[PDB]
Amino acid sequence: QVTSQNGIILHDDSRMLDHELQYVDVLINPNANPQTKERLKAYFESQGLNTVSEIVQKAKQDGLDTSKYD
Amino acid sequence: TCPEQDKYRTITGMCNNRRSPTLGASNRAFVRWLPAEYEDGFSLPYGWTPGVKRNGFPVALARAVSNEIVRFPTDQLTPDQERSLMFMQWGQLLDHDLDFTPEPAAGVNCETSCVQQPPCFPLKIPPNDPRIKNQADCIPFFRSCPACPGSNITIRNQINALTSFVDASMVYGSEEPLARNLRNMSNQLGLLAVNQRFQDNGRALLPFDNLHDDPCLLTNRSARIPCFLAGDTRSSEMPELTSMHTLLLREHNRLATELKSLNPRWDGERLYQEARKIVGAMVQIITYRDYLPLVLGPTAMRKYLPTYRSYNDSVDPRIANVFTNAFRYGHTLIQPFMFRLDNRYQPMEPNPRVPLSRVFFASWRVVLEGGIDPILRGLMATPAKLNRQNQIAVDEIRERLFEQVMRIGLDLPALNMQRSRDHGLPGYNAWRRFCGLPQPETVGQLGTVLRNLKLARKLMEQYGTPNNIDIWMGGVSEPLKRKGRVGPLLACIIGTQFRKLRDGDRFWWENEGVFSMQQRQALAQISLPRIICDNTGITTVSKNNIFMSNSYPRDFVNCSTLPALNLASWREA
Ligand code: HEM
Ligand SMILES: [Ca+2]
Ligand SMILES: [Cl-]
């Protein structure tokens, strides 16, 4: 899950990515494309992030800017 | 358990070969073409116990070999007048499709300590080192993770975290979680995710990765640009590499966009898989039609890469342990600067020649100092360094590797030799015998293999016998094949591995059933020049062969003269 070469950590699979936090904007959009909204809820459910609040908490815990989600 | 119908490769490479479904899949052990040679017969590298010899001779310190044989005056670098720096760069990008050998992260911390205790195998410092005056210091080194960890019953092997197939896995990933992270899940268009905060003259950049101690930030603390995210985890290691990943990401999205216009009913998955399948074929074509011939030269190319007949499910497509070390030959092609050229192929100011030691992990230079076009034009119109027996590798990588992100500058050539010992790779003569070539036992024989008695002496003085020469050091020491850029030993190892990757790949693009006849006719027209035209602001590009052309304006043409890939035959009936 943590890959490193020559001491330097190059990737940590357990850290949330920034462009994926923006998928929350689809989950909270009441008028979002219902087919896409369901795929994103399946995707996050697969990672053990089952509520929008669990997504946000894990983003903030991983150093991302979770303003916009007060 | 494999399906009997499947249109696309798996992300992990599982099920490529149906009777042996782990072959070439990711996170399995390298294959051994020869048996491991460890100091204790199963795990400890030669050079581990002070005073224990190898075949009756003392183990030369890797850093002393680097100092005495590899070092040379940068003054005297010799440009290769028949190779672009793009020849170097394709080589690295390709390596990152084929192999990555995991190691543990920072008992004792191998990064700050010089104690030899597992997993640390630090390089000790020879007396009178030109750079490291404290002989009690060391260059840090982590041993590669063992394939069967915690076991003496068995002989140590290492892991390949990547799909061995030439399948564009440095774009799409080699494990399914990361492969989903790379995709654009905001829609059904089949796209790779692009950076949301920055753009390169309105063209896509790679997304950002999320690292706790991000190294790209240390290279410029006030620019606060983190490392990029691609299929392979090393994509920010240098901006020339970043530019290639960025290039292929755009091409993916460009092809998925055309394909949707042609097949409006296709869902995102189909679009992603079809584009991914073209990108894969393009990496295969550029590699085997344009890159490998200029590595091996014609003789070796005909001997080790005879013409494709068909898929053979008895061929083992795994990467050999030895290949991960031999294919590092391209370190001898590295120029000590990154060259950026403007839209008239003239030095781009303020800094058109950045020393490599200040571009490692410097993702901020792509975002803030002008995107990927100046970097790509530097690659096409700057010559690669030529390998010569007294000018092997430059000090930017021998003295200053990762200087900005690390307590001490690493020595890449010395790491290659320490890494071959970590991996229990046999020495020079054993690989000569595996390749059916003369094994020199004496200095006069060695001088004749190399056509250089002066270099033969140096090697005997470090190693004691040609049996103990580390594979990488012996391989790059050989004189170059005609119209090629490696000697016979590496030509054999490299050619043999690429033959096996082609013939053992069920999804090789020429294999019956993969593409239609009309698709294979269309794919023959692709070229890396065209792919540059379609996805940047560059309108003048190298003429085929991109890897030979290196001089502006002599070697260049206008983009309008290059036909595009015709996607007509992907239209569904
Ligand atoms: C920008 C130029 C290049 C580097 C910078 C660079 C750096 C590395 C490093 C740090 C390693 C790991 C070192 C170690 O063993 O401790 C490394 C490994 C490999 N390289 Fe390097 N490399 C640069 C450039 C190239 C080029 C042009 C190559 C061409 C073939 C190339 C190959 C390789 C290979 C095959 C490896 C081994 C990878 C593995 O982990 O399995 N590199 N490079
Ligand atoms: Ca691969
Ligand atoms: Cl091997």
Cβ–Cβ < 8 Å for B567, B259: yes
Q: How far is CA B363 from CA A17, B85, B162, B225, B228, in A?
A: 17, 20, 23, 6, 7
Count the helices and strands in chain A (H runs, E runs): 4, 2
Q: Which amino acid is at B378?
A: G
Element (H, E) at B83: strand B79-84
Pair of tokens at residue B534: 């379609």
- The amino acid at residue B568 is A
Please check whether residue A6 is in contact with residue B142, taking contact to mean a CB–CB distance below 8 angstroms: yes
- The candidate with the shortest Cα–Cα distance to B531, out of B562, B495, B485, is B562
Nearest C-alpha neighbor of B295 from the set B244, B331, B330, B335: B330
* DSSP state letters, B407-473: SS-B-HHHHHHHHHHHTT---HHHHHHHTT-----SHHHHHHHHT-HHHHHHHHHHHSSGGGS-HHH
Token reading at B205 = 């950049």
What phi and psi, each to the nearest 5 degrees, are found at residue B355? -60, 140
**How far apart are the two ends of chain B, measured CA to CA in Å?**
32
Q: Are B320 and B35 in contact (CB under 8 A)?
A: no
B423 assigned to active site: no
Q: Is B106 exposed, middle or buried (0-12, 13-18, 19+ CB in 10 A)?
A: middle
- Tell me how close the Cα of A3 comes to any Cα of chain B, in angstroms: 6
CB atoms within 10 A of CB B220: 17
Q: Torsion over CA of B40, B42, B46 and B47, rounded to 10 degrees?
A: -70
Resolution in A: 2.4
CB B544 within 8 A of CB B529: yes
Structure token digits, residue B159: 């892991």
Contacts of B406 in chain A (CB under 8 A): 6-8
Distances (CA, A) of B168 to B90, B203, B568: 12, 21, 23
SS3 B96: helix
Distance in angstroms (rounded) separating the CA atoms of residues B186 and A35: 11
* Residue ID of nearest Cα to ligand 1 atom 38: B100
The 3-class SS string of B464-475 reads CCHHHCCHHHHH
Q: Are strands B540-542 and B383-385 parallel, antiparallel or unpaired?
A: unpaired
Closest by CA position to B559, among listed B545, B536, B549: B536
Among B138, B442, B137, B94, smallest CA distance to B283 is for B94
Phi, psi for residue B120 in degrees, rounded to 5: -80, 140
Amino acid making up residue B90: W
* B-interface mutation test, from A3, A4, A6, most B Cβ less than 10 A away: A6
Question: Do B510 and B492 meet the contact criterion of CB atoms below 8 Å apart?
Answer: no
Contact A6 B187 (CB under 8 A): no
**Tokens coding B493:** 């190892």
What are the backbone angles phi and psi of residue A51, rounded to the nearest 5°? -125, 150
User: Which of ligand 1's atoms lies nearest the C-alpha of B89?
Assistant: 27
Cα B439 from Cα B459, distance rounded (Å): 15
- Do the strands B159-160 and B138-139 form a parallel or antiparallel pair, or are they unpaired? unpaired
Could you tell me the two tokens for A35? 């087919």
Coil/strand/helix, residue B328: helix
Query: B504-513 as b/e, with b when 16 or more CB fall inside 10 Å?
Result: bbbbbbbbee
DSSP state, residue B81: E
Given the structure tokens 């950076």, which residue do they identify?
A: B195
Identify all chain B residues contacting A17, using CB atoms and an 8 Å cutoff: 181, 207-210, 229
CB atoms within 10 A of CB B222: 6
Q: What φ, ψ does residue B322 adopt, rounded to 5°?
A: -60, -35
A14 touches chain B (CB under 8 A): no
Check if the beta carbon of residue B297 is closer than 8 Å to that of residue B406: no
Residues of B numbered 362-391 whose beta carbons fall under 8 angstroms of chain A's beta carbons: which are they? Answer: none
Residue B210's identity, in one-letter code, is N
Spell out the residues 6+ positions from residue B535 whose beta carbon is closer than 8 angstroms to its own.
Answer: B203, B247, B250, B251, B254
Q: Is there a contact between B256 and B189 (Cβ–Cβ < 8 Å)? A: yes
Alpha-carbon distance of B51 to B171, in angstroms, equals 46
Handedness of CA B411, B416, B419, B424 (dihedral sign): negative
Q: Which atom of ligand 1 is nearest to the CA of B240?
A: 1
Taking the C-alpha atoms of residue A23 and residue B361, their distance in angstroms, rounded to an integer, is 28
> Do B486 and B80 touch, CB atoms closer than 8 A?
no
- Whether A68 has its CB under 8 Å from any CB of chain B: the answer is no
* Non-local CB neighbours of B561 within 8 Å, separated by 6+ positions: none
Closest residue of chain B to A5, computed from CA coordinates: B103
Please, where are the H alpha helices in B286-372? 292-304, 321-326, 364-368
d(CA B502, CA B284): 9
CB atoms within 10 A of CB B538: 19
Pick the residue from chain B with its C-alpha nearest to A17: B210
CA B251 – ligand 1 centroid, Å: 25
Are B489 and B432 spatial neighbours (Cβ–Cβ below 8 Å)? yes
Task: Yes or no: say if B331 and B519 are a contact pair by the CB < 8 Å rule.
Answer: no
**DSSP string computed for B155-223:** ---BEE-S--SSS-HHHH-SSHHHHHHTB-TTSSS-PBP--SS--BTTB--PPBP--TT-HHHHTTTTT
> What type of residue sits at position B416?
N
In the beta sheet, which residues pair with residue B31? B320
Q: Round to whole Å and give the CA distance between B454 and B466.
A: 15
Distance CA B387, CA B486 (A): 9
Sequence letter at residue B25: A
CA-closest candidate to residue B86, choices B268, B264, B341: B341
Which of B228, B130, B217, B142 is closest to B181 using CA atoms? B228
Give the type of residue at B365: R
**Would you mind telling me the total number of residues written for chain B in this entry?**
573
CB B41 within 8 Å of CB B424: no
Beta-carbon separation of B402 and A8 below 8 A: yes
Q: Which of B435, B339, B351 is nearest to B379 (CA)?
A: B339
Exposed, middle or buried: residue B16 (CB in 10 Å: 0-12, 13-18, 19+)?
buried
Provide the β-strand partners of residue B160.
B28
Determine whether the annotation assigns residue B26 to a binding site: no
Give percent helix, percent strand, percent coil of chain A, each to the nearest 5: 45, 15, 45
CB distance B564 to B547 below 8 Å? no
Instruction: Inform me whether the C-beta atom of residue B103 falls under 8 Å from chain A C-beta atoms.
Output: yes
C-alpha pair distances (Å), B260 with each of B7, B234, B571, B572: 18, 31, 10, 11
What amino acid is encoded at A56 in this protein? Answer: V
Q: Find the B328 Cα to ligand 1 centroid distance in Å.
A: 6
Residue B34 CA, distance from chain mean position: 22
Residues after which chain B is discontinuous, using a C–N cutoff of 2.5 Å: 106
The residue assigned the tokens 């008028």 is A31
Q: Which of A3, A12, A39 sits opposite B185 (nearest CB)?
A: A39
Say whether B299 sits in a helix, a strand or coil: helix
Going from the C-alpha of B369 to that of each of B18, B334, B340, the distances in angstroms are 48, 22, 10
Nearest to B463 by CA among B58, B113, B117: B58
Secondary structure of residue B124 in the 3-state scheme: strand
Structure tokens at B49: 């116990």
**Proportion of chain B in helix, strand, coil states, percent, rounded to 5:** 40, 10, 50
B contacts of A5 (beta carbons < 8 Å): 100, 103, 234
Which residue type is seen at B439? Q
Helix (H) or strand (E) holding A40: helix A34-46
Residue B545 preceded by cis peptide, ω within 30: yes
Distance (Å) from the alpha carbon of A33 to chain B's nearest alpha carbon? 9
- Nearest CB to A3; choose among B111, B140, B233: B233
Distance CA B43, CA B350 (A): 51
Domain with residue B111: its CATH number is 1.10.640.10
* Start-to-end Cα distance in chain A: 30
B165 is in an annotated binding site: yes
Distance CA B187, CA B66 (A): 52
Q: E strands along B274-317, which residues?
A: none
Pocket flag, ligand 1, residue B320 (CB < 6 Å): no
Distance between CA atoms of residues B474 and B325, nearest Å = 11
Give yes or no for a contact between B534 and B564, defined as CB atoms under 8 angstroms apart.
yes
Token pair belonging to B366? 């792509």
Residue B243 contacts residue B376 (beta carbons within 8 Å): yes
Task: Report chain B residues whose CB lies below 8 A from the CB of A16.
Answer: 210
Q: Which residues sit opposite B84 in a β-bridge?
A: B383
- Report residue B528: phi and psi, to 5°: -65, -35
Q: Do A10 and B213 touch (CB under 8 A)?
A: no
> The domain containing residue B78 runs over which residues?
1-573
Contact B210 A6 (CB under 8 A): no
Identify the experimental approach: X-ray
CA distance B159 to B146: 7
Our count of domains for chain B comes to 1
Backbone angles phi, psi at B323, to 5 degrees: -60, -40
In the 8-state DSSP scheme, what is residue B237? S
Angle, helices B528-535/B239-262, rounded to nearest 10 degrees: 80
Query: How far apart, in whole angstroms, are the C-alpha atoms of residue B497 and residue B323?
Result: 7
DSSP classification of residue B540:
E
Of the partner residues A4, A35, A63, the one whose CB lies closest to the CB of residue B210: A63
Phi and psi of B97, rounded to 5°? -80, -30
> Residue B398 and residue B401: Cα distance in Å, rounded?
7
For the record, the structure tokens of B413 come out as 């050539």
A13 vs B105: CB contact, 8 Å cut-off? no
Joined tokens for residue A37: 């909204």
Quick check: B523 and B565 in contact, CB under 8 A?
Answer: yes
Evaluate: CB of B323 within 6 angstroms of ligand 1: no
Comparing CB atoms, the residue among B140, B185, B209 nearest residue A23 is B185
- Going by alpha carbons, the residue nearest to atom 26 of ligand 1 is B92
In this structure, what token pair is assigned to residue B283?
A: 């990496």
Closest by alpha carbon to B236, among B196, B195, B277?
Answer: B195
Can you say how many angstroms the Cα of residue B571 is from the centroid of all Cα atoms in its chain? Answer: 35
Compute the distance between CA of residue B445 and CA of residue B252 in angstroms, rounded to an integer: 52
Q: What's the length of chain A?
A: 70
